[PDB]
Design an enzyme around this catalytic site. Structure first.
Site, short mmCIF file in Angstrom:
data_model
loop_
_atom_site.label_atom_id
_atom_site.label_comp_id
_atom_site.label_asym_id
_atom_site.label_seq_id
_atom_site.Cartn_x
_atom_site.Cartn_y
_atom_site.Cartn_z
N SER A 38 23.28 63.94 19.95
CA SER A 38 23.30 62.58 20.48
C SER A 38 22.21 62.44 21.54
O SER A 38 22.15 63.23 22.48
CB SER A 38 24.66 62.25 21.08
OG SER A 38 24.58 61.12 21.94
N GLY A 97 25.39 64.66 27.88
CA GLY A 97 25.06 65.86 28.61
C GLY A 97 24.61 67.00 27.72
O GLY A 97 23.45 67.42 27.78
N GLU A 134 23.28 56.86 30.42
CA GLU A 134 22.51 57.16 29.21
C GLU A 134 21.01 56.99 29.40
O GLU A 134 20.26 57.85 28.93
CB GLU A 134 23.00 56.28 28.05
CG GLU A 134 24.46 56.47 27.67
CD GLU A 134 24.72 57.79 26.97
OE1 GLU A 134 24.06 58.79 27.30
OE2 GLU A 134 25.58 57.82 26.07
N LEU A 155 10.71 69.96 2.51
CA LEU A 155 11.03 69.59 3.89
C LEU A 155 9.77 69.29 4.69
O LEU A 155 9.76 68.36 5.50
CB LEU A 155 11.84 70.71 4.55
CG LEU A 155 12.87 70.25 5.58
CD1 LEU A 155 14.09 69.67 4.89
CD2 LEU A 155 13.26 71.40 6.50
N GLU A 211 6.96 68.10 3.69
CA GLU A 211 6.23 66.90 3.29
C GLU A 211 6.55 65.72 4.20
O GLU A 211 5.73 64.80 4.30
CB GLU A 211 6.56 66.56 1.84
CG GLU A 211 6.26 67.68 0.86
CD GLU A 211 6.60 67.32 -0.57
OE1 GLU A 211 6.79 66.12 -0.86
OE2 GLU A 211 6.67 68.24 -1.42
N1 LIG Z 1 27.91 58.30 15.23
C1 LIG Z 1 28.63 59.04 16.06
N2 LIG Z 1 28.33 59.07 17.41
C2 LIG Z 1 29.07 59.84 18.26
C3 LIG Z 1 30.12 60.59 17.77
N3 LIG Z 1 30.69 61.25 18.80
C4 LIG Z 1 30.01 60.94 19.93
N4 LIG Z 1 29.01 60.05 19.61
C5 LIG Z 1 28.03 59.45 20.53
O1 LIG Z 1 27.73 60.30 21.63
C6 LIG Z 1 27.44 59.51 22.76
C7 LIG Z 1 27.74 60.23 24.07
O2 LIG Z 1 27.31 61.57 23.99
P1 LIG Z 1 28.30 62.66 23.35
O3 LIG Z 1 27.69 63.29 22.12
O4 LIG Z 1 29.61 61.98 23.03
O5 LIG Z 1 28.51 63.77 24.51
P2 LIG Z 1 28.16 65.32 24.24
O6 LIG Z 1 27.12 65.50 23.16
O7 LIG Z 1 29.42 66.08 23.91
O8 LIG Z 1 27.60 65.85 25.65
P3 LIG Z 1 28.56 65.88 26.94
O9 LIG Z 1 28.05 64.90 27.97
O10 LIG Z 1 28.54 67.27 27.53
O11 LIG Z 1 29.96 65.49 26.54
C8 LIG Z 1 28.32 58.27 22.62
O12 LIG Z 1 27.65 57.13 23.10
C9 LIG Z 1 28.57 58.16 21.13
O13 LIG Z 1 27.89 57.04 20.62
C10 LIG Z 1 30.42 60.57 16.42
O14 LIG Z 1 31.36 61.24 16.00
N5 LIG Z 1 29.67 59.79 15.56
#
Ligand SMILES: Nc1nc2c(ncn2[C@@H]2O[C@H](COP(=O)(O)OP(=O)(O)OP(=O)(O)O)[C@@H](O)[C@H]2O)c(=O)[nH]1
Ligand SMILES: Nc1nc2c(ncn2[C@@H]2O[C@H](COP(=O)(O)OP(=O)(O)OP(=O)(O)O)[C@@H](O)[C@H]2O)c(=O)[nH]1
Ligand SMILES: Nc1nc2c(ncn2[C@@H]2O[C@H](COP(=O)(O)OP(=O)(O)O)[C@@H](O)[C@H]2O)c(=O)[nH]1
Ligand SMILES: Nc1nc2c(ncn2[C@@H]2O[C@H](COP(=O)(O)OP(=O)(O)O)[C@@H](O)[C@H]2O)c(=O)[nH]1
Ligand SMILES: [Mg+2]
Ligand SMILES: [Mg+2]
EC number: 3.6.5.-
Lengths: 430, 431, 431, 430
Positions: C132, C136, C175, C244, C246
């Site tokens: 994501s 964090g 974010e 991959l 390409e």
């Molecule tokens: N598409 C999708 N997005 C997700 C999912 N789970 C979390 N997210 C996204 O992750 C964003 C926040 O970061 P996270 O990935 O949840 O947190 P993290 O990667 O565990 O990192 P930490 O801060 O340590 O918790 C949120 O805004 C969500 O949109 C998921 O299962 N599917």
């Protein structure tokens, strides 16, 4: 097999011994009549350590009970386990010591010293490989301090190679039981400081504290304190009586524990000690036991260990154990309490594990520590000694028994050296 | 290839011995009662003319406690009663007692048995000695036996397995004295020593194995596999057999540097086995990682001087060469310049056996490595530092002196130890 | 064509991973217990010498909660236990924690697994990284891995799937700091990143799909099809295979512009499928409409620089050329002048599979588009605006600073981000 | 696993804790005796968060109950769930604080501070990965405000890295329970404003309002108010105890919620709260919950949020949920209430969802808001403080416990700075 002979002198020694043999006999499954009714065959594997086997399966403990007055020993005969000891080992006098070291060491006890040696020698010969002697007594009493030291000097002259342990009850800091304890203690220590290899200092004040808070016992009697002392006494000799993964006999403890010959005064400890109310709420695991044994609140000596440093420490575990947990927990204590050990000894913990646990417990441990904080105990006694001897408070009783005043100053000077020696090693190389 | 004699001295050695001999019996199929319900079990056993096989071992201790367990244990019938030599009073963790005072009394009884054991051998490859580097009997009495064996059996292999004091964990206060003193008296006599630390094996049991409650029945049982791999060549046939004397010829470039460390792969639990192929490269690469060696010293901190990969089981020689070739081209893994060739390959057909109730999984393919690395100098230095830190103030010297030993011996011991540290420095540098 | 390694970091990545691997197993027919009740599943799986196939993935998180579900989930047997690396304390949505303080402790453990995974590959196409952009662990730790992977595996493909912060929807307050900081540390190391927004996929679930109650089990399940289309060429045969590497050669004209957006067609419910032919032109024309792209940025607002139409199923090459030809003649659809050729066609024979219980209908013909459009600059600008709007007053800088990070890093991050915005301006204009 | 240790000080803290552990134990299916009788295996997955497992499946909560007088803690022992806490954790004094911060912070509580730390340290060591501490107390009381701040300063010095939450009951605007609350509150805040990472301000006046109109409860007792406080307390830690689609531990909430270190005072909220009469007439869906949580009528703080602006907001949902609905509703609140959020933070909502709902509810949400309206609360206390201290209304009681008048002005000046800092950020860039 390795064998030990037990000596108990005075009211304190005899009463501790009575409870001690109740605990020892119970573990080996011995009926009060002396018969064996145990369930595990491993109890008789080393029953020779403490008991001489007589005809008909009647095991007789080789203990020598000494008291200058019949009183205390008479009650032992009528006690629950009175009929187990050999009648001839009850070497009792008539004129009891008047709580003065002189009478129990020079005038009265000197007449009974020869009789006691006769019983001890027969026991020593009855053994195939004698290891050492044990003495239980009090440093504040007359017979114990007097007769005990007189016995120690004599047997040492006759068994220099063997070991002699001394479970000695030491005067408490705040509340005393006898007025003239300082004279007896200082003189007694002057004999022990050069004749015994290891000592287990115990004080009633610490034992009262353990019952009050660590065990939540509302009405503690000497039927309770002597059990804790016995429990530690049994733990020290468990490896001799039963097998284990890592064993440690009496000699092994002494070599590891004693850096220098004169610094052989220890302070014992036991775990687990839990009240029936708090028993349910606590988990019984190696990590929990390690914290309690090193807790200053559980030490059987008044001196607070945190006021000083540890030269050597020994923890003898019992029951089913995990060696990894034992090493990890000892590693934690070594690092966490960084400043509680003298640096010039890189590692201070000597560990030992026995397979059999005590009584109904599934796990137990006995703590032994050669802390320099015990210098405080000797410091107080010397201060009290000089307070009285400065003007001969009670010296006419001792001088009238044949003692000379020069002996008191010699004992005082020797005692002062011990504190100075202890203080020297509390320093560090850097 | 004929007999190799095993001498188990001290509580550590004896407790290791019963684990080893339990392993030996299962491999050859000898029941716990000594009956053999074919031609290669003669290296470690003697056929008692009746279908009963007696192990070719001498169990010595100064305390009846440990050997008493064996006498009353399941393997009571297995051992010759006269072999189980026991003393009266333990050495009390004192080197002087185990060597001079109480050791001298029982040394002759041991040598009497060893001579009788040796006479019934058409060929005697050498002696295996299991002992603890730190301890009274395991370090004081073994020095006596090493001196006694050397005079009688000069130029015969004398292998020893030693429990080196762990860098961090310790179970006795006077180990630095005991460990350094024994090193001085065994350096000239011993041929090579396989070093193992209790702390290192504890780490393996937690990380590699999934056992959260390991005991000495686990360390010794795992340590037993090390000896089995070393002596499999004698007891079994296979390409590139490695006799007992090949170890001293290959792993000891200089007489005073003969302390190879131990490593074994694979070490995996039953559940974790299902998710691993355990091919020759997979097991081989594990042997050279810090996470698997049985001495806590970090191999990456130094350089290798020789290695002997004792492969075992369903293994192919080509894969061994390829896997070894991959190791030698690693830049992180360094081999000393003056030794262009470091590996001593050895392959055997008999796979490792499974001990019922054990924590190790069934593997059809295993590898055991013996390596002589200069990184072990980091272990001697800590022992040296822990010695003078106490000897400067005479921490416990009175106990040793009173047992018929001279103070000067302490000075000589460290001086010899100091040179040993210098030797590893000299061999570890090249123009 | 050989292994590509998948690294799933953070709650978002891991939850996407289980959706992806659930999809991989069904396509190749591997049961949920890892048993294979033929020659192409080796790209993402390793045969454990017993008929049990282990996914070639490393699941990393700083909190046990998400990985604990997998350990106790239906796919507990599938994954190698050592691959499921987990930390003690989460990163608490702090980039500094995930990178410096708590990230540094667990980085080595991850690299140890990756190296072992890489060694068992005859050929390693590259790495897939699911994370994501905002968060964090998913943004701080991935930067560490990107830096660590780059030094060890230079010039090997490092693909990443990133959950870009939605323009309007947001689930965390910091974010903009986390997203900009990770962009700075991955721009030089990453090869290309496939961007997806949660808000964009939510819109598709409501309009295209008829699901009025979508959940992350729906977004991740739909997002899983994107990765399947991208890696189908490796795992299956067909005309115009697209390896991959390409992607980076075709979709990245300049090193700093490597953020293609995602699009997938068809996405239709079961009931709505009966009323549609779903011919090649029908699905193809959908990919270039604003209503179907998985990033909320409007493509019509900018120009394209490259596209890769990964056709799949019962598709005919002639129709692909005709459909593509029709797209290029549209005046509304604009391609940058300096790229006369923008399309990178790719066709595969294996049709998309149907996940039981899913919201997607069975289609015998599907297309997936990866496009590098300058319109994505409208997404970076909003992130930049949201950053300085907070950093001017130091909205949350104290949390980041206290974790071993310097304030100057914030200034550098935006300055690098500012140049990236300028780059898209430069490439988007021609004489 | 992530672990927390609970501290409860004073009558308010202890009584809130008692209800809090009833709620926590009920969710995990723990019998009042401490045994586990739950139905879902997911309850034990993270039971380590709050309970130490003892032998026999008896789970013991690691809570430290502190009160300078035995009274309140005595009732807890006789309560329905009294027999679950460990007896040794009941660190109770004898001389209760006279509702003055000085006595509970300098004279009496200072003697008991060392004893409490002994219990806390054992709990902290019992954990494998400690996350943070929790303190429940009241700012208007003597022991809670005094002992609570003394504990906070000490543990902070000993656990700087970890987190510490403070669920503090704050004086109500209209009706007070103690005359000298202004002195205690101002001094207490001076300690919290620099030693704690997050605070959950609650006032009885708001809770009385919620029961009166939002719940139609005719006779609300502290058996009712403490349940709402507990419900919010459980919601904040749900992600630690149970899984979910988007999790948020204690650290995650603090980082998102606190822009600046000194502005760490929040106001909690809960949903759904419906009377049994109105339960039938209302649909339970995400849109309905969102409206109530942001309703000023549901806030657990007297300060009206509409009088100020929100810096950060956190809504922790529980139970089966739809992420799209959560995002849409949060988008609606963000846009509709345009002027209720400071612009210099582009997005103010931090969301978290947990799979398990609370008690019998199928869906719930807990609201946390870092509004600048709370400056009004501190403004009133300062006004009352200056009204009394202007002529030393009750200062002789505090000065007689060792406090100096200079401390009161330092606390007043520090408190005034907090209001000024809050007012600064209520402005906008343009
Ligand atoms: N598409 C999708 N997005 C997700 C999912 N789970 C979390 N997210 C996204 O992750 C964003 C926040 O970061 P996270 O990935 O949840 O947190 P993290 O990667 O565990 O990192 P930490 O801060 O340590 O918790 C949120 O805004 C969500 O949109 C998921 O299962 N599917
Ligand atoms: N690996 C392993 N080490 C052991 C075992 N038993 C004892 N040791 C080690 O031995 C060291 C101490 O020396 P010991 O062997 O126990 O003593 P000893 O050989 O009987 O010599 P004595 O001093 O006379 O008792 C300890 O530090 C242990 O690490 C065992 O069963 N397995
Ligand atoms: N722990 C313990 N100490 C005792 C007991 N009985 C006596 N003492 C101690 O013994 C001391 C008195 O000395 P005592 O031995 O009775 O005089 P003696 O008969 O001449 O040796 C007192 O200070 C008591 O503290 C007992 O049963 N247990
Ligand atoms: N919400 C709530 N507040 C309480 C409760 N009991 C006491 N309080 C508050 O506590 C304040 C009194 O302080 P208190 O904690 O009793 O004094 P202390 O014992 O010295 O800490 C009063 O203003 C009450 O509003 C309770 O059960 N619930
Ligand atoms: Mg021994
Ligand atoms: Mg996370």
């Amino acid at each position: 097999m390795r064998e030990i002979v037990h000596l108990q002198a005075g009211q304190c020694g005899n009463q501790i011994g009575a409870k001690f043999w109740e605990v020892i006999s119970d573990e080996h499954g011995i009926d009060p009549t002396g018969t064996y009714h145990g369930d595990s065959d491993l109890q008789l594997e080393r029953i020779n350590v403490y008991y001489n086997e007589a005809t008909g399966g009647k095991y007789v403990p080789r203990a020598v009970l000494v008291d200058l007055e019949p009183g205390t020993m008479d009650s032992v005969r009528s006690g629950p386990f009175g009929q187990i000891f050999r009648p001839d080992n009850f070497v009792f006098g008539q004129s009891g010591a008047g709580n003065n070291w002189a009478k129990g060491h020079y005038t009265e006890g000197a007449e009974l010293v020869d009789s006691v040696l006769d019983v001890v020698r027969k026991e020593a010969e009855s053994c195939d490989c004698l290891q050492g002697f044990q003495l239980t007594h009090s440093l504040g009493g007359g017979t114990g301090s007097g007769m005990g030291t007189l016995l120690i000097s004599k047997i040492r002259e006759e068994y220099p190679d063997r070991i002699m342990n001394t479970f000695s009850v030491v005067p408490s800091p705040k509340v005393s039981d006898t007025v003239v304890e300082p004279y007896n203690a200082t003189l007694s220590v002057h004999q022990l400081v050069e004749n015994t290899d290891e000592t287990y200092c115990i004080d009633n004040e610490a034992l009262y504290d353990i019952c009050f808070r660590t065990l939540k016992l509302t009405t503690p009697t000497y039927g309770d304190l002597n059990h804790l002392v016995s429990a530690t006494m049994s733990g020290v000799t468990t490896c001799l009586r039963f097998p284990g993964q890592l064993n440690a006999d009496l000699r092994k403890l002494a070599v590891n524990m004693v850096p220098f010959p004169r610094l052989h005064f220890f302070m014992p400890g036991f775990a687990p000690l839990t009240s029936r109310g708090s028993q349910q709420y606590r988990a019984l695991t190696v990590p929990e036991l390690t914290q309690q044994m090193f807790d200053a609140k559980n030490m059987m000596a008044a001196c607070d260990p945190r006021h000083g440093r540890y030269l050597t420490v020994a923890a003898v575990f019992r029951g089913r154990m995990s060696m990894k947990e034992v090493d990890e927990q000892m590693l934690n204590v070594q690092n966490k309490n960084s400043s509680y050990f003298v640096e010039w000894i890189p590692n201070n913990v000597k560990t030992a594990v026995c397979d059999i646990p005590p009584r109904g417990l599934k796990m137990s441990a006995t703590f032994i520590g050669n802390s320099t904080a015990i210098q405080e105990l000797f410091k107080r006694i010397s201060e009290q000694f000089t307070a009285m001897f400065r003007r001969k408070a009670f010296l006419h009783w001792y001088t009238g028994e044949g003692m000379d005043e020069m002996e008191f100053t010699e004992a005082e000077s020797n005692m002062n050296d011990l504190v100075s020696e202890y203080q020297q090693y509390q320093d560090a190389t850097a | 290839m004929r007999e190799c004699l095993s001498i188990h001295i001290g509580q550590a050695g004896v407790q290791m011995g019963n684990a080893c001999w339990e392993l030996y019996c299962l491999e050859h199929g000898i029941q716990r009662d000594g009956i053999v319900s074919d031609s290669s079990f003669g290296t470690f056993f003697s056929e008692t003319g009746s279908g009963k096989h007696v192990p070719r071992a001498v169990f010595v201790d100064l305390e009846q406690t440990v050997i008493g367990e064996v006498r009353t244990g399941p393997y009571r019938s297995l051992f010759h009663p006269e072999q189980l030599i026991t003393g009266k009073e333990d050495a009390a963790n004192n080197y002087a007692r185990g060597h001079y005072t109480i050791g001298k009394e029982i040394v002759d009884t041991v040598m009497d048995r060893v001579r009788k054991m040796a006479d019934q051998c058409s060929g005697l490859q050498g002696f295996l000695i299991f002992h603890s580097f730190g301890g009274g009997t395991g370090s004081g009495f073994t020095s006596l036996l090493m001196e006694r064996l050397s005079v009688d059996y000069g130029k015969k292999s004398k292998l020893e397995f030693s429990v080196y004091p762990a860098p961090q964990i310790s179970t006795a206060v006077v180990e630095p004295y005991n460990s350094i003193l024994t090193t001085h008296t065994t350096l000239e006599h011993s041929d090579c020593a396989f070093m193992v630390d209790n702390e290192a094996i504890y780490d393996i049991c937690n990380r590699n194995l999934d056992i959260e409650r390991p005991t000495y029945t686990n360390l010794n049982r795992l340590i037993g596999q090390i000896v089995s791999s070393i002596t499999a060549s004698l007891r079994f046939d296979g390409a590139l057999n490695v006799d007992l004397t090949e170890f001293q010829t290959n792993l000891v470039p200089y007489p005073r540097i003969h302390f190879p460390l131990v490593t074994y792969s694979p070490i995996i639990s039953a559940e974790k086995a299902y998710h691993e192929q355990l091919s020759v490269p997979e097991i081989t690469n594990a042997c050279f990682e810090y996470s698997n060696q049985m001495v806590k010293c970090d191999p990456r901190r130094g350089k290798y001087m020789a290695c002997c990969l004792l492969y075992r089981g369903d293994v192919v020689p080509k894969d061994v060469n390829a896997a070894i070739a991959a190791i030698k081209t690693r830049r992180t893994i360094q081999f000393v310049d003056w030794c262009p060739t470091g590996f001593k390959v050895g392959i055997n057909y008999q796979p490792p056996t499974v001990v019922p109730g054990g924590d190790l999984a069934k593997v059809q393919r295993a590898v055991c490595m013996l390596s002589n690395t200069t990184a072990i100098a980091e272990a001697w230095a800590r022992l040296d530092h822990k010695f003078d830190l106490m000897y400067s103030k005479r921490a416990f010297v009175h106990w040793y002196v009173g047992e018929g030993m001279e103070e000067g011996e302490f000075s000589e011991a460290r001086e010899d130890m100091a040179a040993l540290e210098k030797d590893y420095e000299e061999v570890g540098t090249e123009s």
